[PDB]
Scaffold this motif. Structure first.
Motif, mmCIF file in Angstrom:
data_model
loop_
_atom_site.group_PDB
_atom_site.id
_atom_site.type_symbol
_atom_site.label_atom_id
_atom_site.label_comp_id
_atom_site.label_asym_id
_atom_site.label_seq_id
_atom_site.Cartn_x
_atom_site.Cartn_y
_atom_site.Cartn_z
ATOM 1 N N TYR B 38 0.833 -1.204 0.000
ATOM 2 C CA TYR B 38 0.000 0.000 0.000
ATOM 3 C C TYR B 38 0.870 1.258 0.000
ATOM 4 O O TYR B 38 0.872 2.051 0.939
ATOM 5 C CB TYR B 38 -0.944 -0.010 1.197
ATOM 6 C CG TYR B 38 -2.014 -1.073 1.139
ATOM 7 C CD1 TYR B 38 -1.760 -2.369 1.565
ATOM 8 C CD2 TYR B 38 -3.288 -0.779 0.670
ATOM 9 C CE1 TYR B 38 -2.733 -3.341 1.523
ATOM 10 C CE2 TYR B 38 -4.271 -1.744 0.624
ATOM 11 C CZ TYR B 38 -3.989 -3.024 1.050
ATOM 12 O OH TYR B 38 -4.963 -3.993 1.005
ATOM 13 N N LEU B 39 1.628 1.424 -1.080
ATOM 14 C CA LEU B 39 2.470 2.599 -1.263
ATOM 15 C C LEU B 39 2.135 3.249 -2.596
ATOM 16 O O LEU B 39 1.933 2.553 -3.594
ATOM 17 C CB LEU B 39 3.958 2.245 -1.215
ATOM 18 C CG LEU B 39 4.874 3.469 -1.295
ATOM 19 C CD1 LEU B 39 5.426 3.821 0.076
ATOM 20 C CD2 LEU B 39 5.990 3.272 -2.305
ATOM 21 N N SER B 40 2.083 4.577 -2.609
ATOM 22 C CA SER B 40 1.828 5.333 -3.824
ATOM 23 C C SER B 40 2.847 6.452 -3.973
ATOM 24 O O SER B 40 3.089 7.222 -3.038
ATOM 25 C CB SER B 40 0.411 5.911 -3.830
ATOM 26 O OG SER B 40 -0.561 4.885 -3.726
ATOM 27 N N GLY B 56 1.101 1.121 -5.632
ATOM 28 C CA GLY B 56 1.567 -0.217 -5.322
ATOM 29 C C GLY B 56 3.068 -0.353 -5.328
ATOM 30 O O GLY B 56 3.584 -1.477 -5.357
ATOM 31 N N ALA B 57 3.787 0.773 -5.346
ATOM 32 C CA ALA B 57 5.243 0.827 -5.247
ATOM 33 C C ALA B 57 5.938 0.268 -6.483
ATOM 34 O O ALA B 57 7.170 0.296 -6.566
ATOM 35 C CB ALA B 57 5.728 0.092 -3.995
ATOM 36 N N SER B 58 5.172 -0.249 -7.446
ATOM 37 C CA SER B 58 5.765 -0.788 -8.663
ATOM 38 C C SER B 58 5.019 -0.450 -9.944
ATOM 39 O O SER B 58 5.603 -0.612 -11.021
ATOM 40 C CB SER B 58 5.889 -2.315 -8.561
ATOM 41 O OG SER B 58 4.625 -2.909 -8.314
ATOM 42 N N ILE B 59 3.773 0.010 -9.886
ATOM 43 C CA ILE B 59 2.956 0.164 -11.083
ATOM 44 C C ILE B 59 2.896 1.636 -11.469
ATOM 45 O O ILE B 59 2.460 2.480 -10.678
ATOM 46 C CB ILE B 59 1.537 -0.394 -10.858
ATOM 47 N N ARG B 60 3.329 1.936 -12.690
ATOM 48 C CA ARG B 60 3.236 3.291 -13.217
ATOM 49 C C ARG B 60 1.818 3.594 -13.681
ATOM 50 O O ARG B 60 1.078 2.697 -14.099
ATOM 51 C CB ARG B 60 4.225 3.491 -14.368
ATOM 52 N N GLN B 95 3.113 8.084 -0.288
ATOM 53 C CA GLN B 95 2.048 8.066 0.698
ATOM 54 C C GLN B 95 1.436 6.675 0.772
ATOM 55 O O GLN B 95 1.201 6.035 -0.256
ATOM 56 C CB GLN B 95 0.973 9.104 0.360
ATOM 57 C CG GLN B 95 -0.252 9.049 1.246
ATOM 58 C CD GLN B 95 -1.445 8.443 0.542
ATOM 59 O OE1 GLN B 95 -1.489 8.392 -0.690
ATOM 60 N NE2 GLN B 95 -2.420 7.979 1.313
ATOM 61 N N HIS B 96 1.188 6.217 1.996
ATOM 62 C CA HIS B 96 0.620 4.899 2.229
ATOM 63 C C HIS B 96 -0.881 4.925 1.955
ATOM 64 O O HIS B 96 -1.542 5.945 2.177
ATOM 65 C CB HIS B 96 0.890 4.433 3.660
ATOM 66 N N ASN B 97 -1.412 3.799 1.483
ATOM 67 C CA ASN B 97 -2.820 3.680 1.139
ATOM 68 C C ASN B 97 -3.475 2.503 1.859
ATOM 69 O O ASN B 97 -4.500 1.986 1.414
ATOM 70 C CB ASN B 97 -2.999 3.541 -0.373
ATOM 71 N N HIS B 98 -2.889 2.070 2.973
ATOM 72 C CA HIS B 98 -3.411 0.935 3.725
ATOM 73 C C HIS B 98 -4.580 1.405 4.584
ATOM 74 O O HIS B 98 -4.395 2.187 5.519
ATOM 75 C CB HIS B 98 -2.317 0.306 4.576
ATOM 76 C CG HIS B 98 -2.581 -1.119 4.944
ATOM 77 N ND1 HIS B 98 -3.785 -1.541 5.469
ATOM 78 C CD2 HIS B 98 -1.801 -2.224 4.867
ATOM 79 C CE1 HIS B 98 -3.733 -2.843 5.694
ATOM 80 N NE2 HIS B 98 -2.539 -3.281 5.336
ATOM 81 N N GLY B 99 -5.782 0.927 4.262
ATOM 82 C CA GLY B 99 -6.964 1.317 5.011
ATOM 83 C C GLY B 99 -6.924 0.927 6.473
ATOM 84 O O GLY B 99 -7.431 1.667 7.320
ATOM 85 N N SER B 100 -6.340 -0.228 6.788
ATOM 86 C CA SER B 100 -6.217 -0.648 8.176
ATOM 87 C C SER B 100 -5.179 0.153 8.945
ATOM 88 O O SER B 100 -5.100 0.021 10.170
ATOM 89 C CB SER B 100 -5.876 -2.136 8.250
#
Lengths: 119, 114, 110, 387, 651
Positions: B38-40, B56-60, B95-100
């Motif tokens: 959960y990284l953007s 997702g730290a890997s997807i453009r 920025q993190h995108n982890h809902g939990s």
């Protein structure tokens, strides 16, 4: 393409309240999530709250849980953030953004407003 | 709040070179059930709303050229540009995108100079 | 049945009205203003048993009436007018709604 | 306490005969909703009245609906005494404090099955229309039969779909072969269905017909298609006038208020005005009895011991009152069932055999009826002796 | 040639669109001289002044239809009820557009009410449709609002009637409570994990908090809630992995009012083709008469079918074929995971992530192993012996060198009048004990032997209150849940087969008489008995019911009633004292007794050739393998060996 338009600049006396508007269009207003972010000039954006229009589910930042309130109007597809007890610390730029979700998996904020400066 | 550590804080390079910007989270942004980070990564230029660069730290993103390359997983992440252009000059935030793992937090940021 | 009240006053004030002749949880209590130069007025009533309160439109927002079921006292608070005050109770046979038992009177002045 | 007694009547009921108790007596003719609201809001400013006793002469059932709604919106108990305002509604609400008089469908159904048992008519069917509330009646009958000493013979239930086309509905109407038939319908559909059955020939003397109080409308309005001898039960007791009803209502209210005063003194509370609650009688008058008459209510608002009356149609085209209802039992003025062979002028019924026998040891064994169930054992037969 | 229309709207843009639609209604209907006059009013905070004002104004305007279209009411009551009742006093049809309370489907109260949105019972119907997908038959129900809880329960019962299945548990209570953990613990012990939720958001948040404290969100749990349950603060406490439903376009009032107005215009033009077109008077003052075309107009509107989606009022006057969506709580962000068609469910490509483990459907139907067996004091099959020192049974060996396998049984000392409450662990053995031991050895489970509080098999008897027939004895305990499987010489009859299940009987015998040293029932001296010939039977036993069934032996039923004994031991002792003269009882028991006591003699007749079997609960997987095991025991020499142990032996 979706568009989010915010209200104009506001000059508010300290301790007073402001209610900002964010008109949304170009997408399903009911089945998306909108987030309000606080960005001071020269500073990164601070997440304030998010609300789901389909269920009225509201979740605020703890720093702004007692300061900001969110409402929506389904007829106009416009988001609202009412900021009360305004102080000089609130002199910043507020933005409304629509969440981008792909395959049911959120991938980040894909849409943005133009920004609103509150003095 | 998960502490997002960005390195370097700023850098200046000549056009055509390759740069690397790192992102470190205080906690693992990877959820074991789905094995996704959960990284953007974002590109923020002056006077404009930030533009979502890599998720997702890997997807453009579709608009992101292949020259951008995001790597790293778990707590440590990296943004790499193979061929740096003048237009890429901006302050990039992870920025993190982890809902939990609410609330959403941002790193210190990296300023790109040419 | 006999009634007693507070003393004179001279901002905001509070006046007590204590009951020592009956069951205080059964009958209403009414407040009257008798500023010299005219007959009288009417402020509101309170029932200690349940706490239902009604106020007069002229005095609405300026007089607050409260009661304590333990000490059998009546409290009327005026906020932010120099007149003689009375707290009274009806006979209880109803319908007539007359005033029979009268207090002593508290003289407030500004 | 402060009680208002309002009567909407065409029958000449005058007004002079009508620690803090005050009573209000009025006479009203019109029954439009605006008049009701205006009168209620006017009297609500009249010295804090907590009691409301109402009756109606018309036969419109929306008056009770509006009365219940206004009672809920004012938190003031209201009674139903006569007319459409006293008609038993479907399902009251705990928010409401409106209460009625008279029995529901289930009590009357129990009385009907008691009447059927007392004459040993153990073969029947079930005919139901599209009138609302039929499924509750079906479920109550199913539950009542399975826990009974009789072991009733029930034919398949007849359910109508629309105004009978007499194309497929007659197919179901033909299969009705019993002597006792149960019908649940409105008054308008009853004329059609009874004319249909009379054309089908199911209008014989043995083909009895039983209907609840719903189908029996105005006493003056009597359709010609009802055979002389229809079985009906309605709570309209003509020996007791409305004066007794309102007096009993006053007794109920006074007893409830007096008994609720001691637990908590400040119970009687009415709202201040129309424009611009902890302890009440809502859950308190479940148990109450005045002058021996148990006037208690149920958890849904109904009565505990109502006054039901059994009525039939004589040859003079009149609803003839026959049997009343006791505290729990059923009394019958006419023990021997009259034949009523003449329902109309086209019915020459004459099929019966008066048989008289003598007590002979192996052929005629005279035994007393079984006291355990009050029914002759199935291998015996009914009889009588003028002793 | 004019049509008056009254409306209640506050938003000015919506009122403008309403007027635009009214104007456009006269477009496709030609240049006919019919006119549509519009009338609108706004909100007021009160509900009596609004009611009277709207009633008087729309009565004076002589309108035909009335609409309510305001979701965002600060009042949580959602009450258009005064409008409905007042416009129903004159049987003038009313149209609802927002309210979805199931009370408004009842047309005995609301005479002239229709709405174009489905109440929540349709969500129960969709849930029953979902049950057809994953093959589930056990559910747990909990509804709080008792105004609509009864309606939801009745709808669920109607749904289940097709499969003739019954819910494992249902619950209703007063909304706003918080101590609901006791019912949660009660539901935990059951087998089903299907939880049905329909309540207010306060109750939903309360129960989510209580369940999170009790840790009931693990694997295998089935979760299913309605739309009202996942909004407000209720969404905040929602455990992850839950499934939610969605009302498509239930809030975009624009197209909703547009469709409603189009339907109204088409219905009005359809009615204009008919005769006897009267109008409502100024019923505000002195007009006590109803609209004689009231029911006529209502029925005209009921038959309103359209195709431009399809709008169609059922016999409840509600819209059908509504589209529902399915949402899932994926890390507390709602994700669309399915849709519901008019009568079908179409899942999408999104994964079904559950609170527990796999994405596949968890079989939330638990299993059972520890069985609470009940048995009765049977002289040749179930022996009673006090323990030696403390919970111990003396290991006595048979004459064949086989140790006697006993079992620790817990039962009362004597009957209640003699021994009120004195239960001690004792030693039980005989025939059925060995059979149960063999059953437990063959299969995989555990057990716990206990006695029955009385010595009567069980009869259906009226309880003095409510005039309701109730059971007792073994059936009384088994149906109460305190027992699980009756293993005893159970007399198979017709009453028991309706209430409980059986397997293949393990015994073959009939009925006879015990005498001391008539020729069966055909004795004339027993047809009309006297004080000399004393024949008796066991009180509240199956034989008494069997003889009561045939009324031809009513005199025998009138004689045995005076001398019914509690147990077979009492009758045997009394006839040994020659206080009795006959005893109708089973054949095998009396044969073993005659072997024990040489003076005991049986008669000749062998009638009513029934069997003894194993009583069970209702349809359970503890039936098929149980009956197969009983048959496999009957086929080989196991029964002969058990007879060698107890039946074959003579004394």
């Amino acid at each position: 393409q979706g568009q989010m338009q915010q209200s104009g600049a506001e000059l508010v006396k300290p301790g007073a309240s402001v209610k900002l508007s964010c008109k949304t269009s170009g997408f399903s207003f009911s089945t998306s999530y909108i987030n309000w972010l606080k960005q001071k000039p020269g500073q990164s954006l601070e997440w304030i709250a998010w609300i789901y229009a389909g269920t009225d589910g509201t979740s605020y930042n703890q720093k702004f849980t007692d300061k900001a309130q969110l409402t929506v109007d389904t007829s106009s597809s416009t988001a609202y953030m009412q900021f009360s007890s305004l102080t000089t610390d609130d002199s910043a730029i507020y933005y409304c953004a629509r969440e981008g979700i792909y395959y049911g998996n959120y991938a980040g904020f894909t849409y943005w407003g133009q920004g609103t400066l509150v003095t | 709040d998960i502490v997002m550590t960005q390195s370097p804080s700023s850098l200046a390079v000549t056009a055509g070179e390759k740069v690397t910007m790192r992102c470190k989270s205080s906690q693992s942004l990877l959820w074991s059930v789905n094995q996704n980070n959960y990284l953007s990564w974002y590109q923020q230029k002056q006077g404009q709303p930030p533009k979502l660069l890599i998720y997702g730290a890997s997807i453009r993103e579709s608009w992101v050229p292949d020259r951008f390359t995001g790597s790293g997983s778990g707590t440590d992440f990296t943004l790499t540009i193979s061929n740096v252009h003048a237009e890429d000059l901006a302050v990039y935030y992870c920025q993190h995108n982890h809902g939990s793992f609410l609330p959403y937090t941002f790193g210190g940021g990296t300023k790109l100079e040419i | 049945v006999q009634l007693q009240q507070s003393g004179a006053e001279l901002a905001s004030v509070k006046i007590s009205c204590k009951a020592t002749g009956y069951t205080f949880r059964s009958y209403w209590i009414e407040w009257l203003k008798q500023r010299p130069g005219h007959g009288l007025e009417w402020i509101g009533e309170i029932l200690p048993g349940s706490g239902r309160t009604n106020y007069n439109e002229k005095f609405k927002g300026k007089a607050t009436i409260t009661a304590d079921t333990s000490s059998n006292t009546a409290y009327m608070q005026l906020s932010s007018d120099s007149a003689v005050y009375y707290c009274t109770r009806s006979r209880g046979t109803m319908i007539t709604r007359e005033f029979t038992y009268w207090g002593q009177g508290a003289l407030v002045t500004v | 306490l402060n009680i208002a007694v309002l009567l909407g009547h065409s029958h000449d009921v005058t007004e002079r005969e009508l620690l803090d108790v005050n009573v209000v007596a009025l006479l009203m003719n019109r029954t439009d909703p605006k008049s009701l609201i205006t009168h209620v809001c006017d009297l609500m400013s009249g010295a804090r009245i907590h009691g409301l006793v109402f009756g109606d002469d018309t036969d419109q059932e929306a008056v009770a609906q509006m009365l219940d709604f206004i009672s809920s919106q004012t938190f003031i108990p209201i009674l139903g005494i006569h007319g459409g305002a006293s008609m038993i509604m479907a399902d009251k609400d705990p928010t409401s404090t409106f209460f009625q008089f008279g029995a529901s469908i289930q009590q009357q159904a129990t009385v009907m099955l008691k009447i059927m048992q007392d004459y040993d008519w153990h073969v029947f069917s079930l005919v139901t229309t599209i009138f609302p509330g039929y499924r509750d009646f079906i479920s109550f009958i199913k539950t009542t039969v399975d826990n009974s000493f009789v072991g009733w013979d029930m034919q398949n239930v007849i359910t109508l779909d629309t105004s009978f086309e007499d194309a497929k509905t007659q197919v179901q109407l033909k299969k009705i072969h019993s002597s006792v038939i149960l019908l649940y319908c409105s008054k308008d559909e009853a004329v059609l269905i009874l004319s249909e059955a009379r054309s089908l020939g199911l209008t014989g003397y043995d083909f009895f017909w039983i209907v609840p109080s719903l189908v029996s409308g105005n006493t003056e309005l009597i359709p010609k298609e009802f055979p002389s001898g229809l079985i009906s039960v309605s709570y309209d007791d003509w020996d007791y006038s409305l004066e007794a009803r309102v007096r009993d209502g006053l007794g109920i209210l006074t007893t409830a208020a007096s008994s609720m005063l001691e637990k908590f003194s400040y119970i009687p509370e009415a709202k201040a005005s129309c424009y611009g609650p902890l302890h009440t009688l809502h859950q308190f008058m479940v148990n109450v009895t005045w002058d021996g008459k148990d006037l208690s209510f149920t958890e849904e608002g109904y009565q505990v011991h109502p006054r039901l009356v059994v009525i039939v149609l004589n040859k003079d085209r009149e609803w003839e009152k026959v049997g009343k209802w006791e505290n729990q039992t059923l009394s019958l003025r006419h023990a021997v069932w009259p034949r009523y062979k003449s329902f109309s002028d086209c019915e020459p019924d004459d099929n019966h055999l008066s048989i008289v026998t003598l007590e002979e040891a192996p052929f005629v064994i005279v035994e007393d009826i079984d006291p355990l169930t009050e029914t002759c054992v199935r291998n015996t037969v009914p009889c009588r002796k003028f002793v | 040639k004019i049509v008056n229309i009254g409306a209640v709207l506050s938003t000015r843009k919506h009122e403008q669109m309403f007027r635009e639609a009214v104007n456009q209604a006269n477009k496709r209907h030609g240049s006919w001289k019919i006119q549509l006059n519009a009338t609108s009013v706004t909100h007021k905070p009160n509900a009596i002044q609004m009611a009277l004002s709207v009633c008087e104004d729309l009565i004076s305007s002589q309108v035909y239809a009335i609409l309510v279209s305001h979701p965002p009411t600060p009042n949580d009551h959602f009450t258009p009820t005064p409008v409905s009742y007042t416009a129903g006093f004159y049987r003038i049809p009313v149209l609802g557009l927002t309210t979805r309370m199931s009370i408004y489907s009842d047309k005995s109260i609301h005479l002239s009410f229709l709405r174009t949105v489905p109440p929540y019972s349709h969500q129960s119907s969709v849930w029953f449709e979902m049950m057809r997908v994953y093959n589930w038959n056990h559910i747990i129900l909990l509804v709080s609002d008792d105004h609509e809880g009864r309606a939801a329960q009745k709808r669920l019962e109607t749904l289940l009637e097709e499969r003739e299945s019954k819910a494992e548990k249902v619950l209703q209570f007063d909304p706003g409570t918080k101590n609901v953990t006791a019912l949660l613990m009660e539901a935990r012990d059951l087998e089903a994990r299907v939880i049905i939720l329909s309540a207010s958001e306060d109750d939903a948040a309360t129960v989510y908090r209580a369940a999170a404290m009790l840790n009931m969100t693990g694997s295998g749990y089935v979760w299913l809630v309605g739309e009202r349950e996942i909004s407000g603060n209720a969404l905040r406490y929602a455990p992850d992995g839950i499934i939610g439903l969605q009302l498509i376009n239930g809030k975009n009032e624009s197209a909703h009012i547009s469709d409603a107005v189009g339907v109204v215009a088409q219905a009005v033009h359809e009615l204009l083709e008919k005769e006897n077109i009267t109008d409502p008077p100024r019923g505000c003052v002195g007009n006590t008469n109803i609209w004689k075309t009231g029911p006529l107009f209502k029925r005209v509107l009921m038959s309103s079918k359209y195709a431009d989606g399809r709008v169609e009022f059922n016999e409840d006057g509600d819209r059908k074929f509504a589209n529902y969506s399915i949402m899932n709580l994926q890390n507390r962000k709602l994700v669309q995971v399915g849709i519901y068609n008019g009568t079908h469910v179409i899942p999408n490509d999104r994964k079904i992530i559950w609170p527990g483990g796999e994405t596949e459907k968890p079989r939330g139907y638990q299993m059972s192993t520890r069985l609470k067996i009940v048995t009765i004091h049977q002289e040749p099959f179930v022996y009673v012996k006090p323990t030696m020192s403390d919970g111990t049974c003396k290991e006595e060996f048979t004459v064949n060198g086989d140790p006697v396998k006993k079992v620790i049984c817990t039962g009362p000392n004597d009957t209640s009048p003699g021994s009120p409450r004195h239960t001690v662990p004792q030693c039980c053995y005989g025939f059925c004990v060995d059979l149960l031991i063999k059953l437990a050895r063959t299969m995989n489970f555990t057990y716990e032997v206990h006695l029955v509080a009385d010595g009567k098999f069980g009869t259906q008897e009226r309880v003095n209150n409510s005039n309701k027939k109730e059971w007792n004895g073994m059936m009384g305990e088994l149906l109460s849940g305190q027992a699980d499987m009756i293993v005893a010489p159970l007399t198979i009859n017709n009453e028991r087969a309706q209430y409980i299940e059986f397997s293949k009987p393990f015994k073959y015998q009939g009925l006879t008489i015990l005498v001391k040293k008539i020729t069966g029932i055909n004795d004339p001296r027993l047809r009309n008995p006297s004080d000399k010939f004393i024949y008796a039977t066991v009180k509240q036993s199956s034989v008494d019911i069997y003889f009561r069934r045939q009324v031809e032996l009513s005199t025998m039923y009138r004689h045995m009633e005076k001398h019914n004994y509690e147990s077979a031991a009492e009758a045997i002792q009394a006839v040994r004292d020659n206080k009795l003269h006959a005893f109708i009882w089973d054949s095998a028991v009396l044969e073993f007794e005659a072997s024990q006591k040489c003076d005991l003699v049986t008669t000749g007749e062998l009638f009513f050739r029934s069997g003894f079997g194993i009583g069970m609960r209702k349809d359970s997987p503890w039936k098929q393998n149980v009956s197969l095991s009983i048959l496999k025991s009957h086929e080989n020499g196991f029964m002969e060996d058990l007879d060698k142990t107890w039946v074959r032996y003579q004394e």
